[PDB]
Amino acid sequence: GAQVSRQSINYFNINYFKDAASSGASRLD
Amino acid sequence: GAQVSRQSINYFNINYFKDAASSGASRLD
Amino acid sequence: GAQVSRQSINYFNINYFKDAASSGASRLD
Amino acid sequence: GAQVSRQSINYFNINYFKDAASSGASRLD
Amino acid sequence: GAQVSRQSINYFNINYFKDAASSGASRLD
Amino acid sequence: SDRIIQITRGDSTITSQDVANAVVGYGVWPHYLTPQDATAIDKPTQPDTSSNRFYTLDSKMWNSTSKGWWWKLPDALKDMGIFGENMFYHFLGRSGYTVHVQCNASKFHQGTLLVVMIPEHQLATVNKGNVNAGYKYTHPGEAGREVGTQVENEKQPSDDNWLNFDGTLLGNLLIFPHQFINLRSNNSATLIVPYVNAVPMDSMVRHNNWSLVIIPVCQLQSNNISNIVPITVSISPMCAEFSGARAKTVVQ
Amino acid sequence: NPVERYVDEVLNEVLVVPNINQSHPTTSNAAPVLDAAETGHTNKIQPEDTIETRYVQSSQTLDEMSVESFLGRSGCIHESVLDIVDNYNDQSFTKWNINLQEMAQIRRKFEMFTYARFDSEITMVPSVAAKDGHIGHIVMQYMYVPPGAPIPTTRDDYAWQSGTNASVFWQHGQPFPRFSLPFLSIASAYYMFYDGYDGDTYKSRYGTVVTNDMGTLCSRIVTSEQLHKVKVVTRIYHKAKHTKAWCPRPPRAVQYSHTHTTNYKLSSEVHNDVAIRPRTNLTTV
Amino acid sequence: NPVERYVDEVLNEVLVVPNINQSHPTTSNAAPVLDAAETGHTNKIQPEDTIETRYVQSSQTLDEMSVESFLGRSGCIHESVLDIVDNYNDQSFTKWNINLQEMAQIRRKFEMFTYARFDSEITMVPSVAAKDGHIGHIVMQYMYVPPGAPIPTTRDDYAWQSGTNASVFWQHGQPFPRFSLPFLSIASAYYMFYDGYDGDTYKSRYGTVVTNDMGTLCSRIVTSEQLHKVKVVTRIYHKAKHTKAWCPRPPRAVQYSHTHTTNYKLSSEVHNDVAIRPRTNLTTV
Amino acid sequence: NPVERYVDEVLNEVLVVPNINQSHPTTSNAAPVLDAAETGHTNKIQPEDTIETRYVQSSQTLDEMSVESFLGRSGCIHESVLDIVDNYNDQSFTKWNINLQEMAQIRRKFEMFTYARFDSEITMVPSVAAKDGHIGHIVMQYMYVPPGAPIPTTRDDYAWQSGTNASVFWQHGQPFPRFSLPFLSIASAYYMFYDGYDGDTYKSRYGTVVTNDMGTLCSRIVTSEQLHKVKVVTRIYHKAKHTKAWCPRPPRAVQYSHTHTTNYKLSSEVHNDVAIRPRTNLTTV
Amino acid sequence: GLPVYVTPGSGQFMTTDDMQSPCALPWYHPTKEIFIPGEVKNLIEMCQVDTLIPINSTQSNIGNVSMYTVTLSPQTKLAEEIFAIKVDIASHPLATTLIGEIASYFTHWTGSLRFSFMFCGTANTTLKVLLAYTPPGIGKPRSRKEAMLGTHVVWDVGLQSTVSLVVPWISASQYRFTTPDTYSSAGYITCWYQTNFVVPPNTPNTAEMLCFVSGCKDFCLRMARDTDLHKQTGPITQ
Amino acid sequence: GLPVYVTPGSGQFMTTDDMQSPCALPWYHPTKEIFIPGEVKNLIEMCQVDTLIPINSTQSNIGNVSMYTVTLSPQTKLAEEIFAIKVDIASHPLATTLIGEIASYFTHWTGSLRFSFMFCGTANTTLKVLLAYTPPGIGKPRSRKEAMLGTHVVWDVGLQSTVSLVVPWISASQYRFTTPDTYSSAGYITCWYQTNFVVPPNTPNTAEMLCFVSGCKDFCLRMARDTDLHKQTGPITQ
Amino acid sequence: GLPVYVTPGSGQFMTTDDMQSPCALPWYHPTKEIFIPGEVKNLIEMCQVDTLIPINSTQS
Ligand SMILES: Cc1cc(CCCOc2c(C)cc(-c3noc(C(F)(F)F)n3)cc2C)on1
Ligand SMILES: Cc1cc(CCCOc2c(C)cc(-c3noc(C(F)(F)F)n3)cc2C)on1
Ligand SMILES: Cc1cc(CCCOc2c(C)cc(-c3noc(C(F)(F)F)n3)cc2C)on1
């Protein structure tokens, strides 16, 4: 499941596994 | 087929096969 | 192309090839 | 990019590459 | 994340990695 | 008073003036089979007050060397009135129970019995390879089994109380419905258990659902040892129902 | 907001443990620390009742202690051997009477409950040992033969056609095979223990062998005889999914001896058979 | 709510069996248990009519007994052998006249109906046996030659160009090849049985051979001659999809002898030819 | 417009550096260039205060200098060797006490902070050296044994069943194995340094060995003994994800000696032990 | 491209999988479907049709139509036994019936069974017979008295030649194994003389009875498997 | 088709992964679920039930029910010690208890522990006992005075036979290792005579005490692992 | 299934890639984060602090 966002240039920011440790590098700031 | 949900952070919770035995680990509680 | 349906628990019932013989097992009843 | 169509039985008719020569067999008639 | 556009013939123009150097050939003009 | 109890089942009433509450196994009270969980299509027979009443088993003597006693249900009630007849004339049976263990001594006696009800107590044999406990050993009837007495036949089950006769440690038996009869506090234990099984009804002859195990964890001591201190068990079926009637099964 | 439900799943904060509240000195005739273990109930006293506690905000969660988590990890349940020594026709196929009793690690976890109902995920790990130097092209066939179906007696038995049974063909060099199985019992739950027989005579069988017949797993090297001999060992792993368990019980204290039975061995000095370590005396930590 | 339809598909509860209702003692002159089998109709009596039943809520479902399920499993229909012994040019290619009659397991299931219409899913399992130690780089070509098209007579026949026929090229080490075929008959259904001939003389052929011509499957090792000899066995599996069947019939009781014919062998003691086991007498269970 | 947030991520312009503004000649009694280093604070003077600057629009960004970027690259942390020399049973398995102290490159970066909290991504690179000519079919098992779990003592120890531990099975010829691990400490952050002991006596241990117990990594060649001997070297790579670091410190100036300790060696001519290069004199650039 | 993670199972061939695959004959249009009488959609439709039980399948009878008939006649002793068989759907005298053959392609069964009997004596022959079903947990009955204590039908022969006895589903578990496995052994069907077989003078002193079997509305089969009622011991050739 | 990038990890088999896979028995419908009393959903439900501590597990006692009882009696010296054990949930006298066995399948633990004691002397036997918990960073107490400076309960034996002492979670770190590892060693539980064991004449001069252990509302376990309280040294055969 | 085209680079291991991967300890819940003084978020914070130059680093 992931966070679709709109403006139109959607940013489907998917997280494929059910654990937080599984996602890639963190956003900064 | 799967259960799309919205708030926007959609949780496409997909089940790829047609049998209940095929899905992954169950939700708790 | 496939038959998206809604209630929200969508059932994207995809058919990946352009021939009817290519799809999987039939629905019953 | 591709031509989504609706009636609900969507026909996502995708073309994965940026050249016309890359797509599959043509529609008839 | 990518730029969905509509007219219906959507052009999901996806960029799979988080760096600009990762995308394919540029649009002309 | 929180230390008195009167239990009435059918035409029997049992009392105790020194109890330690009552335990309702797994928190479920016995109830009849519902049509949603049922499977055997014929209409059940429900003897009611003629089978759901207290049946008192043979008494046992507790002395300074006792190692324990065990009974298996419904087996222990096989020669008990209408309930016993029903379990042999029918293929299937289903029932819950009220188990009341009785043992009184005096204020100058000390001792402790751990009274436990175990579901599916599959006994073990010790140092005998893959040979399992034989049918007649696990079907002692109302006389039960006195731990530490039997003449070593081959299919004789384990007699190791500290290993629960099944390869697990005694101190952990408390995870099953249980009570203690600590002579200084109470003189009886009361456990009420529902029907527990993976099928809605079962053969009363081939399958024993519960096992009543009584182990003296603290030795019986007093300064008047000649006075015998017995242990008596009274069991009352609850919501007993049977199905699939036919001729009477004759065993062994 | 189920989405909120999803966020809790991702962070594993579905089941939270309660907080410790602040308590104070007390002088009363309600004595929570006092009770009667004879009742068969555990005293319900908490730290706030005995000491003076501060307020602490508990962050711990119990997700990992769920029955789904405890039984939801693949463990080995069998190691199948097809060792080609001197006769390909006789040694290139074998069979196994399915059960979850041969490997102590997973058997013990499941046996902490009396009944358990679950779906299974089976993963196979085949490894081909080149005894003479080459493995050639190894293709394996694993066939599930439910009780009653014909069991193959030769590497070319007609039963290998698998007209109705489920077979998984694996080719050396491709990912490990895996498939799911639905809850298979004829009852509502699997019996981890069974105090019953299949008859009422001195020769009736006792235990789970009466109720847990799962069929046979027949397997063979599909490839025909090769010059070089190989030894193929296929390890089967099992994991429970969508689990429910009833009536918890004491864990196995001594080693297992055989399948489907609680039988055990006892030596002359029993303290060696259990994990209990002898204390020097009551006061030696 | 088709979605509701989807949920039933996932749980396999599309076709439910009816409940047993409660019945009571009766005394009447309507006797359901009595009837006449002469009519050719089965008596329609149910348990509630003979015994006194309780109310039971049936949960069983018939999904798995559907014709789609019964015929929808891959079974072996052929085992092709390319065994290189002493002449690569002659032994590196072969051909097979397609049919579903050579393997008893699936043939028997299909033959429980008189006509059946279905699409087919073909999966191939090739295995290369290294007879001399090496397999090299094996590439296979399986070509479907519909009746009439030219059949290859050498490993380099021009027909292997496959200008119009369908060919599947498989390379050793890649997943098993698989493809679908639409319902191929010139009629509306396939004949499982055919009481007819292709002429009206004593030499006309009888049976399904008259109607079930499916063509030939020609295959070859595409790779040219290698030093080391290999034996490639390709097993073909078939599964019916989108099935319809008409006029059910009795199952085959004796072994099959040949393709396209109901012919059978009978020995001197016939009870050995059928699955019927001799009873000691009428009263010995 | 988070989408705006996404665009900045793609171009790596999340953290911008400030512009240089135009400045002018000044004559005042506010002297920014003057200060007192004794205060422990760095003088905050900028170029506009000392010289006359022009206006320049800074485009530089600090994204790459983030702690996430600095510690977010896979570095080798261990090289495991299974060298089959003369006894398969003894040499086909091994174990390693997990830590991030054996490889200077990544150890030094992490040690630029006192505490750090992060999730880990582990990637393994196995390579099979054919010492006799063939590798056969190599299948490896890497098992994580948390402190307390039983450690295998033979290649067939029951602990390899992995009933509850996490194991990764890799088959030669498939992609490199990789998995994630959540922050594992019993505290809120990992100690990169620890000025403490596990007791209060002259024999108590000092340092991070007291706090950084991570368990053992047990691995084995799953395949049984093959004729040809192989030497399998598995290199483990680690990368920190979702990182936080506290209290920065001076970088390691001399070589590391041992794990979990700041101990170092010093030779007779110390300038060879540090990266400082001897200057000829104060005025020789 | 899209980052993917190949999962275990990829590349394997499970004979019971349900995937899609490219079509070898593109653009091909199948022959139009015509209406054919007799369509079957579920095998339950075949389990609901009566077929004869080769109940008299002794060795001297197999290979004859007489393996399907039970002989009745004037008795000299009262309450004699006529036949006795196990009730298990895939057990022996009834394994080769249609419902037994279909049940043999599945591992589990549930539901009630319907046994029918048709008397084939003359129109002047009378008879009363007791058909009984003995639930499990006991041996087969040794006398009519022992048998009649179970489920039973007293059949009076008359204008309607056939009677039906329903073996209700009486089981501990919701299903039973179709193959001969004790624990899930369903009991027995026995037949005894209730009165006698009476005939007037000049009438055949013996008569046959045919036995049928089918499934009730609650009959159901589960877990498909290969059958052991048919085999192949050599190649089937052209 | 869709361009994809196969990522590291693809094709591997992680015993703790969470993927989906095709079902080997399509169309199969599982047996309906009936209600069974005693369902467990989380192992915490088992950690909250008291089980006996084999506290007197000396070598001569192991293999006897007496390994579960501590003996009390009239003392001739004041303030004598009765027992002393480590408080660590998976440490030795308490490793084999139910909470100790479950804790042995996890690497970390946190929360408060509840120790209960039931006196089993006669109803005419009196006694006052001091039960103490000594937080870490110090050796086990050598006297009642040293022990009572820590957390403690003075238990007076009377009509209610049982008392409970709660070992509060007093730790530096939020969790501790379940296995015997110094740094995260939780302290000790010791028991001493507060007064004496008094009895009237003609009464047994000794009595037993049973010890139980369970977890409080804040008890929690983390990081699943295999246990070292059970092993397999050979094949488990049929 | 969905037709896919495996691209160059597939299967490789780039030490600086940024992918997701399955978690070896499912259901595990990390220790709550407490506040610790001195957090660093960007190395620029360290470049802005004065440190001494070993300017007189002659050999002696
Ligand atoms: C109690 C209890 C619970 C269970 C279910 C165990 C799952 O067991 C198996 C296993 C381990 C393997 C196969 C199997 N292995 O390979 C195949 C196939 F691929 F051939 F289908 N099936 C089938 C079952 C029912 O068994 N006993
Ligand atoms: C009756 C009846 C029903 C059927 C359809 C059988 C499907 O038969 C096949 C088979 C099994 C294989 C091929 C085939 N094998 O490989 C190839 C290709 F890949 F070369 F196209 N085609 C073609 C058909 C028509 O045949 N008889
Ligand atoms: C300080 C500090 C921070 C860390 C975390 C290091 C991550 O360490 C590992 C490594 C490198 C490998 C494994 C590991 N390697 O393989 C396996 C598995 F696949 F077997 F699970 N686990 C497990 C941990 C905890 O360790 N010390």
DSSP alpha helices (H): ranges in chain H?
A: 2-11, 47-50, 67-71, 88-91, 104-110
CATH number for the domain including G148? 2.60.120.20
**d(C-alpha F101, C-alpha F118), whole Å:** 15
Count of other CB atoms within 10 angstroms of residue G183? 24
- Measured distance CA(H278)–CA(H276) in Å, rounded: 7
Q: Which of I12, I108, I115 is nearest to I66 (CA)?
A: I12
Looking at the complex, does the CB of residue K1 fall below 8 Å from at least one CB of chain D? Answer: yes
Rounded Cα gap, residues G98 and H233, in angstroms: 30
E-state strands within chain F: 5-9, 12-16, 23-24, 55-56, 60-62, 69-73, 90-102, 110-119, 145-146, 178-182, 188-193, 202-203, 210-221, 229-245
Decide: I57 and I19 in contact? Cβ < 8 Å: yes
Two structure tokens written together for I64: 């790459």
Q: Among all residues of chain I, which has the CA nearest to that of K16?
A: I166
Helix (H, G, I), strand (E, B) or coil at G248: strand
Strands H178-181 and J13-14: what pairing? unpaired
Q: How far is G65 from chain B (nearest CA, A)?
A: 11
User: Phi, psi (5° rounding) for residue C6?
Assistant: -135, 145
Only one residue has tokens 């035409």, namely F11
Which residues share a beta bridge with K153? Answer: K131
* Under 8 Å between Cβ of F112 and F221: no
Cα-to-centroid distance, G71 and ligand 1 (Å): 16
**Gap from CA of I153 to ligand 3 centroid (Å):** 20
Could you tell me if G252 and F167 are in contact, meaning their C-beta atoms sit under 8 angstroms apart?
yes
Q: Among I77, I76, I105, I99, which Cα is nearest to I212's?
A: I99
Which of G122, G157, G186 to mutate to test binding with chain J, by most J CBs within 10 Å of its CB? Answer: G186
Cα K47-K52-K58 angle, rounded to 5 deg: 130
The b/e string for K97-119 (b: 16+ C-beta within 10 A; e otherwise) is bbbbbbbbbbbbbbbbbbbbbbb
Query: Cβ neighbours of residue L53 under 8 Å, at least 6 residues apart?
Result: none
What the block records as the tokens of A10 is: 């959607």
Find all residues with CB under 8 Å of J153, minimum gap 6, and list them. H33, H50, J130, J131, J132, J163, J164, J165
How is residue G44 written in tokens? 């319900």
Judging by DSSP bridges, how do beta strands F12-16 and F5-9 pair with one another? Answer: antiparallel
The residue among C9, C28, C29 with the most chain H CBs within 10 A of its CB, best to mutate, is: C28
Residue J190 backbone phi and psi in degrees, to 5: -125, 155
Alpha carbons G141 and G223: distance in angstroms, whole number: 10
With contact defined as 3+ CB pairs under 8 Å, the chains touching J are C, E, F, G, H, K, L
Angle ∠(K62,K66,K71) on CA atoms, nearest 5: 125
Sign of CA dihedral K128, K129, K130, K131: negative
Which residue in chain D is spatially nearest to K3 when comparing CA positions? D16
Tell which phi-psi region holds residue K99, choosing left (phi > 0), alpha (psi between -120 and 50) or beta. Answer: alpha
Question: Is the beta carbon of H77 within 6 A of some atom in ligand 2?
Answer: yes
Closest C-alpha to K38, from G99, G43, F120: F120
CB distance I238 to L13 below 8 Å: no
Closest CA to K210 of J75, L29, F111, I202: F111
Q: How large is the C-alpha radius of gyration of chain G? A: 26
Domain range spanning residue I183? Answer: 1-285
Regarding the beta carbon of H144 and ligand 2, being less than 6 Å apart is answered yes
What CATH number corresponds to the domain at position F114?
2.60.120.20
| Tokens encoding F172 | 């952990």
Q: Where are the alpha helices (DSSP H) in G121-257?
A: none
Task: Say yes or no: CB of residue I187 within 6 Å of ligand 3.
Answer: no
Minimal-distance CA residue to ligand 2 atom 21: H144
User: How many beta carbons lie within 10 A of that of residue F53, not counting itself?
Assistant: 25
CA G98 to ligand 1 centroid distance, Å: 6
Which residues on neighbouring strands pair with residue G75, listed in sequence order?
A: G238
Sheet holding J220-224, edge to edge: J176-177, J106-110, J220-224
Q: Do residues G19 and G55 touch, judged by C-beta distance below 8 A?
A: yes
Please tell me the distance from the alpha carbon of residue K163 to that of residue J62, in angstroms, as a whole number. 79
Measured from the alpha carbon of residue H117, the closest ligand is 2
Radius of gyration of chain D (CA): 11
Assigned token pair, J170: 């009486």
For chain F, how far is it from start to end, CA to CA, in angstroms?
48
Nearest residue, CB atoms, B29 vs list G14, G72, G241 = G14
Do residue H60 and residue K28 have CB atoms under 8 angstroms apart? no
Q: Name the strand (E) or helix (H) holding G47.
A: helix G47-50
The Cβ-side half-sphere exposure at J97, using a 13 Å CA radius, reads 31
Q: Do F136 and G202 touch (CB under 8 A)?
A: yes
Q: Which domain holds residue J174?
A: 1-238
Chain centroid, CA I272 distance in Å: 25
Is E20 close to I10, i.e. CB distance below 8 A?
A: yes
Q: What phi and psi, each to the nearest 5 degrees, are found at residue J146?
A: -65, -40
CB G251 within 8 A of CB G130: no
Cα–Cα distance, G268 to J42 (Å, whole number): 64
Task: Name the nearest CA neighbour of I82 among I173, I207, I1, I170.
Answer: I170
The tally of CA atoms less than 13 A away on the side-chain side of residue J60 is 3
F231 and F69 Cβ atoms separated by less than 8 Å: yes
> Which region holds residue F145: left if phi is over 0, alpha if psi is between -120 and 50, else beta?
beta
Q: Which residue has the tokens 């510690």?
A: I71
Provide the terminal-to-terminal Cα distance of chain I, rounded to the nearest Å: 51
Distance CA K13, CA I278 (A): 55
Our count of domains for chain K comes to 1
Distance G225 CA to ligand 2 centre (A): 28
Residue identified by tokens 């596994």 is: A17
Give how far Cα J183 sits from Cα of F209, H278, I225, Å: 16, 24, 44
Residues in I touching E15 (Cβ below 8 Å): 10
H touches D (3+ CB pairs < 8 Å)?
A: no
Q: Is G244 helix (H, G, I), strand (E, B) or coil?
A: strand
For residue F99, the cross-strand partners are: F191, F235
CB proximity K22 to L under 8 Å:
no
The rounded distance, in Å, linking the Cα atoms of I241 and L18 is: 10
Element (H, E) at H140: strand H139-145
Q: Cα K194 vs. chain centroid, distance in angstroms?
A: 25
Which CA distances in Å does K200 have to F187, I34, K73, K123, K193? 22, 92, 13, 11, 19
CATH label of the domain that carries residue K121:
2.60.120.20
Report DSSP letters for I12-62, one per residue.
Answer: T-SSBPPPBPP------S--TT---GGGSS-----HHHHS----B----B-
- Gap from CA of F199 to ligand 1 centroid (Å): 22
Ligand number nearest CA of I162 is 3
K100 to chain G, any CB pair closer than 8 A? The answer is no
Nearest to F206 by CA among F20, F74, F8: F74
Please count the other Cβ atoms lying within 10 Å of the Cβ belonging to residue B3: 17
Q: How far is J132 from chain L (nearest CA, A)?
A: 56
Rounded-to-integer distance, Cα H207 and Cα H219, Å: 28
Return all residues near H153 (Cβ < 8 A) that are at least 6 apart: none
User: F162 is in which domain, residue-wise?
Assistant: 1-252
In whole angstroms, give the CA distance from residue K234 to residue K80.
47
End-to-end CA distance of chain H: 51
Distance CA F6, CA F189 (A): 12
Query: Which string of DSSP letters, residue by residue, matches J104-166?
Result: TTEEEEES-EEEEEEE-S-TT-EEEEEEEEE-SSSPPPSSHHHHTTSEEEEEE-SSS-EEEEE
CA of I98 to the centre of ligand 3 (A): 6
How far apart are alpha carbons J218 and H17 in whole angstroms? 6
Q: How many angstroms away from the CA of D14 is the closest CA of chain E?
A: 9
Number of domains in chain F: 1
The CA distance from G78 to G65, in Å, is 26
* Strand C13-14 relative to strand C2-3, pairing: antiparallel
φ/ψ of residue K146, rounded to 5? -65, -40
Total domains in chain H come to 1
D22 and D16 in contact (C-beta within 8 Å)? yes
C-beta neighbour count of B29 within 10 angstroms: 11
CB-CB contact of H270 with H166 (8 Å): no
Cβ atoms of G58 and G20 within 8 Å: the answer is yes
Specify the amino acid at residue J128: K
DSSP E strand stretches across F63-204: 69-73, 90-102, 110-119, 145-146, 178-182, 188-193, 202-203
Q: Is the peptide bond before H2 cis (omega within 30 degrees of 0)?
A: no
User: Ligand 1: which of G101, G181, G213 to mutate, most ligand atoms within 8 Å of CB?
Assistant: G181
Residue G237 token pair: 């792993």
CB within 8 Å: J1 and L22: no
Residue J16 in tokens = 């019971």
Closest by alpha carbon to I172, among K11, J127, A14, J7?
A: K11
Cβ H165 vs Cβ J26: under 8 Å: no
Cα G243 to Cα G239: distance, rounded to the nearest angstrom: 10
Q: How far apart are CA I200 and CA K136, in angstroms?
A: 12
Separation of alpha carbons I84 and K42, rounded Å: 45
Chains H and G touch (3+ CB pairs under 8 A): yes
Say how far apart CA H60 and CA J175 lie, in whole Å. 9
What does the block give as tokens for G12? Answer: 């594993």
CA angle J96–J98–J100, rounded 5-degree value:
55
Closest CA to J169 of F92, K33, F207, K30: F92
Chain H interface includes K29 (CB < 8 A): yes
What is K58-127 written as a DSSP string? BTTTTTSGGGGEEEE---SSSS-EEEEEE--TTSTTTTTSHHHHHHTTEEEEES-EEEEEEE-S-TT-EE
Mind telling me how many Å the CA of L8 is from chain I's nearest CA? Answer: 14
d(CA J53, CA J115): 9
